[model samples]
Target: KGLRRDLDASREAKKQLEAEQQKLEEQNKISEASRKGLRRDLDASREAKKQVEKA
Candidate 1:
């Protein structure tokens, strides 16, 4: 049987996908970081309202 040959071929393909997954993870990090950015803007509005309400 040539099962070893098929496994080798798929290993190379899997390694290729592994690199692609690395970049996918990089994009996922953007999603992870964007929430903090949104929260930063939300804080901006809250702080502005807080000072205005202090009057």
Candidate 2:
């Protein structure tokens, strides 16, 4: 009987933690995509500088 309450709380804790894990994963994807976009922008800027130097 005494173990019942403790086990029940542990079950709910795991459920909520899994929910939190999903949220973090989604946030990580967003950051990865943003970083990729920034890299592309830097490449474009470097190309423009090369054209300017040639002219």
Which candidate achieves the best lDDT against the true structure?
2
Overall local distance difference test of candidate 2: 0.68
- Candidate 1 accuracy as TM-score: 0.31
In model 2, pairs of residues that clash are none
For candidate 1, write residues 1-55 as lDDT tens digits. 6547654567767888799978988897774355655566545654557667645
Candidates in order, TM-scores: namely 0.31, 0.33
lDDT of 1 at 15: 87
Score candidate 1 by lDDT.
0.67
lDDT (10s digit) by residue, model 2, range 1-55: 4657654667767899899899999898784355655566555654557666645
Clashes found in each candidate (C-alpha, N, C closer than 3 A): 0, 0
The collision pairs in model 1 are: none
Model 1 segments more than 4 A misplaced: 1-9, 31-55
Q: Lowest-lDDT window of 10 residues in candidate 1? A: 31-40
